[PDB]
Amino acid sequence: AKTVLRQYWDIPEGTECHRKTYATTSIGGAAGLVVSAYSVALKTPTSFLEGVARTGRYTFTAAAIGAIFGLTSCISAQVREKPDDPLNYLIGGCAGGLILGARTRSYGIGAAACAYMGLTAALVKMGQLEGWQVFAEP
Amino acid sequence: GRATFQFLPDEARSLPPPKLTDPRLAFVGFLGYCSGLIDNAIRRRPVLLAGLHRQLLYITSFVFVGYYLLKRQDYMYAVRDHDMFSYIKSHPEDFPEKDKKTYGEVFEEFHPV
Amino acid sequence: NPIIFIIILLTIMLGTIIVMISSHWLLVWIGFEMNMLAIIPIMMKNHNPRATEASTKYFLTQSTASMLLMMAVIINLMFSGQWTVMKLFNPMASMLMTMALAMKLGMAPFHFWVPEVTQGIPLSSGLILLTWQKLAPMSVLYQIFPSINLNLILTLSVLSILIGGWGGLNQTQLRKIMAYSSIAHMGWMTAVLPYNPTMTLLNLIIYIIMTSTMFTMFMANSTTTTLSLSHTWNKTPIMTVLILATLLSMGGLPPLSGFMPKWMIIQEMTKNNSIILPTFMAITALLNLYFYMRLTYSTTLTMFPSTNNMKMKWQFPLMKKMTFLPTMVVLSTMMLPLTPMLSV
Amino acid sequence: SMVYMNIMMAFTVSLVGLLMYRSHLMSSLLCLEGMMLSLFVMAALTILNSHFTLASMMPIILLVFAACEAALGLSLLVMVSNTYGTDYVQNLNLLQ
Amino acid sequence: PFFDVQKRLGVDLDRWMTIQSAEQPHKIPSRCHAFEKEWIECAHGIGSIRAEKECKIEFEDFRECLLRQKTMKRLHAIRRQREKLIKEGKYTPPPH
Amino acid sequence: LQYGPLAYILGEKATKKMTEKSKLITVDGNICSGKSKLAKEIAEKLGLKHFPEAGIHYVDSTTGDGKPLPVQFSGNCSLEKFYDDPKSNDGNSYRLQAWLYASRLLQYADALEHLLSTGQGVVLERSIYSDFVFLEAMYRQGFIRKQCVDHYNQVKKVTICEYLPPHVVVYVDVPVPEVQSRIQKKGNPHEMKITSAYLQDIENAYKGTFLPEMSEKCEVLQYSAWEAQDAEKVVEDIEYLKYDKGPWLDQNDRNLHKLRMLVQDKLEVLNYTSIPVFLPEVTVGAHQSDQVFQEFTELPGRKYRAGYNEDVGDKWIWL
Amino acid sequence: LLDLIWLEAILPKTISLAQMKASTLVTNQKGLIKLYFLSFLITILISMILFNFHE
Amino acid sequence: MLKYIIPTIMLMPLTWLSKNNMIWVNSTAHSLLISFTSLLLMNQFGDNSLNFSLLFFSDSLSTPLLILTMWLLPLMLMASQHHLSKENLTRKKLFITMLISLQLFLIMTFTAMELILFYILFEATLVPTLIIITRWGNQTERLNAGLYFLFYTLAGSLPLLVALIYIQNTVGSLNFLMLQYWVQPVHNSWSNVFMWLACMMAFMVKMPLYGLHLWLPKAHVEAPIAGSMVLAAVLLKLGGYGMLRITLILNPMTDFMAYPFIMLSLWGMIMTSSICLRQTDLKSLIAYSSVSHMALVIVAILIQTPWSYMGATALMIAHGLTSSMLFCLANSNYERIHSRTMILARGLQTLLPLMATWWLLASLTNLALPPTINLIGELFVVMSTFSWSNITIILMGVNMVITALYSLYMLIMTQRGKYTYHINNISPSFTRENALMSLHILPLLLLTLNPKIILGPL
16 A cells, blocks of 8 residues: 555665565565456456466566565665665666566567666656655645 | 526626627627538538528527627626635735835846856 | 337436436436436347347446445445435445446446447447436536545546557447547546536537537448548538548647647646646547547548449438537637636 | 444345356346345335434335336346347357 | 526425434434534534534534444443453342 | 328328238349330239339439430440450459449339338339349359359348338249340340350249249249230239239238338338438448459549539529 | 668657557457456455555 | 738638639739738837737747748749649639638747747647648658658647646746746756756757657658648748747756757757768758758757857748748659659750759859858857857868758759650740749848848847
């Protein structure tokens, strides 16, 4: 829920590089279940132990992304100059995206997984850096 | 905002009314003047100056209705500002009086190229 | 048959008045109960075995979408016992309310209510009557409005145009192309409803006009996009110019008046320091235009009128109230300084 | 009390996997008429101890539509078997 | 949109059967009739957006008149106040 | 024949004119056998408005006044040009059959239009069902292809849905192929030498193809001889009039039947046969090509503006 | 070799990107009235667990 | 404009109202008469400023730019009649009316009094251009090019509305450019990047950078009857000038991130003209000349501080007249040889002697021969960006080198002979072919006498 972000955005802020990537693989790990549930429902019946959706590798993929997605940041947060920055957290975009690039082979997916993920990476921490609010009221 | 479910209430008497030769009322029905020409053009007329009795009563329609429509448009802005200025008039703590300061107070940036 | 066809047709709009004229949750239950009773004959008229296997896919989707509503009433019957149509006093009720009613208006979840019905009903004639069922629950969300969770009503609406957009680029059947972009134009209005719930009705009155005038143009012969080729040089070349004008108007281009809603609706969506919310949707309805371009690339460029068949006779259908539709659905953008002070 | 939890557990006779599936569609229309009496009772327990004196005409009117509703739905389920002889919800022709 | 025809021309289409204290055909009130009339007295000319955070006292007891939530908890905990001391005396009261 | 909803709720048109005088009758015949020697002769006594068979100029024979415009605008395969039966051509010999079918269908769509309007019987020359008999010897003579045969075979299940069948359908007295002398002695310079493969095959195709409608509930009155000539004239006049009401219908199939109560057999055929532009409305051609039934986009797509002078002849102002 | 390739590679990728995902949403909506309603139930439960929706 | 729009709408119920083939002479007659009235009240004085009437005009005071917009409807009708005269009169009446309908919105544009009146008129075009692109072209690749002309212009222009409505309720109201006396500055932030960037990027999509020029040799290559909207589409490109109205004020102090727009458009300038010397389609040869020395203004606007606005204004209507005529040189000499392949048109300069001067005095304006309106424009840009950094004379000097070898390569391909073929190509460049090729250089070298009329504020 929102309190996961209230333990993500609150305590670490670059340092403590194990609990950063322990919590940031929970969210991205959880969304592998959501893409699994429609891939057994909107797609027809799979093998004997549903969910066995067609190609598999769904929750195998999603939790692996959030496993490194703190780890690429929290290493590179402290080792350079010790803030958290938009250029700091940019680094977790590309190689964080390249998990989907590593599997289901590249040269047409992987660099495109690298490029666009780096666009949407830095804007998130940029969001609270300017105080951006998506779902607001007057 | 009271006196519910009227097309336009009783209290719209002291509004001007929006008298004619205003360009909207010329324009309302000018599109109807265009619409009656379309009304021939759909049906392989093949005139484009067809029966005037079909080409009239479009002009009569939009102008009458559009006039009777605009009497509440000018009402609704008139009732809009009427309630704002009252809430401006009460509660002066939400509406302070700013100080008048000329250009002897400000030291702005200063950024030249 | 002729007189009883009116009495069925008359009570459809009598079902939806009681939805609006009500201070009591029991009467709004009856209101669009009998609409789900009095649509089922109109589905039938020529008795074809797709139509019977389409209304039954229509039916039980609007039986459950009925049935969860009465569940939502009896929960806040227990809490404070007032039955006026107002805020629902319980977050377990309002959550069950809004995503029950999201099936009758169908949003992006509760998906295939919209294409699977409207496709292949042999009554393509109208089926303009699917504008009342978009009009009854919107008259219910005007009152319930100050009791929602503000995340669910946007998440059904952010998904609305992102999946009503993609769904129809893979189509030919122009009833589905009208069935699609009918979820999209339900995406723009309920993204706004928490913020100033009028300037929602502006989008709806525009949506009734531009969609009703689309079906009346279609009632010469038109079934498929390939059939939309073979009437420029055969039926009337003025029809090809007209069918261009409304589509380019319904895409939202600023020389016409389908740009009238958005232009005004972003005046409300920002002014509430919400900027990343409209910039997503405003760039999303752009590939809602690649339906319409690539549809206009069929009829307006003389694309192969073959199979020589002459219509040497005139046309006598009833194009009722057609002469005044593309004169308020195109040319009104200058003439509306305040349409949102009549409707307000 | 516990007289409301049972029965609010018994409102889950919708359960949507068994509200249109699987075949013999009469099994699905069954729980559509059986979803009533989880609304007819859950209303009747609340109007009756708390003496409203007037809203108890509403459980009488709650049956009158849902009977006429389901009777209409049962008319069409003959028409799917009038053309076939078997209802069999894995009949699908008009795609989406 | 809420047209409200029945406020213009004075028929009551419904209205009577809406709240817990309206008419009572032979004047038999409910169990919480005293708090309905008291709570509706609070928010009448108030526009209900300040009523959620100002009144807040005449509504909460009325919610607790109807379900008896903490009254049943103050009663249930007396079964754990005593009644482990069944064998440690204090029958209290002796019959009758 | 109904005129909108408003007239239809005052006076209906199902049965107050058809007082058993429906009697929708056709003939089948063969070439030079049942043309007008027997067909046109019987209009009176029974009051039957005769309709002609076919021709390129049937659409020119309506909408006016009325003189037939030439074969340039109605570009068909030209009666007495296709008698060269061009087995290898551009062509096309199939493009006749499209306009042959649409000039056929408008007679039968005016047939039912005329009956409920008035109440008169109508003899036809050859109905919509006769068009497949030609295709048997159009096939085995090499001047047609497949993937054109299937096309109108797909139109036949599309365009024929509401058509109540004819009643005492006459296979005319037809010889034992004496038409080889009939096609010669009666003139016909362009109807020429083409041998028994077109003669015998259509004659074999009157029996085994037309049999299900001949075995449909409307009883037939069949002859096979030289001619009627006061032997089958009165015998198909009197004893067919006894077969108009008494020995007339079995499953009854055509009556403007039991939905004649302002219901689906009373208006919904007599409102869908009025204004005959919705009758050839599914007469739209192929998916794209069909390689015979085509017209190019702008040449001859520019043969339309020549046939569009003012696009409607006369209507003036003030009306 | 550049002006018609690596400016034309990145943006008309987006034409071939959306139409790759405009096919996964009609050809997986292939009827299956049994499988509409098994997927309504996943949507109705995931609103309970996820977020703000009960709060 | 008091009433310039009001007579030029009255041109529209004159065309269909007319007779038969008189429809060409009736339209071109009255359309020339506005050119007196266009000059008439305008060009007044002049020292801060001419607010004109109301909320509909600031009179296009310091940037005239609008007299050139009114030549063209009596310049294109004499050009379009070459291969149009085979269609119906009912469509020949159409193609004149939408062309006037394109001039209507351009007249309330360039003046526009506001910034939100600008946008709705900035986007009020692109509907009558697209009708001239899709219908009335030649063989295919019209239809994808009809879609590349959209979706760059329209994808960029929608984040204007997010930012222009954002200003209208932040600081007063934008409705006047003369209520822009109170302007708060725009500092360095992470939200004020995007306010600058979204407000700027929708202008880059029309006057192209080196990136995102991918639609410009699509609409101009496959193009109507005789350059008929191609003359309009070159004005419309330079009719995205409004960066001069915006960026002078309204975030004035962001040069911090000008550099990815400088280097992209200053190195792209030296390459995108170099990438054209191997063209084989003649109308695509000119189409890249229009990329290069249009993109010199993009490094002339972002670099502020005039002696550049002296030149950046003079360059907008430098090739307004030059690149128009070059398209007219190629809309002619295609009516006779039916290919636009530059190989095929050889054996020339003997057959058509009178138009040899029309080739040269076109191509002598890119060499630009300093007393013209051209090297009074570049030599203010050169002396401006010298004072940015001295090193910029190198790239801009090699810009002057390659376009010298580029313009003559189109001339010298006609100075050959023996013609090998061509029983056709007889028509000795008739009276119309020289008339619409004139009225280009006749104002172009005339204004070089007193070009104080062509200057900004400045």
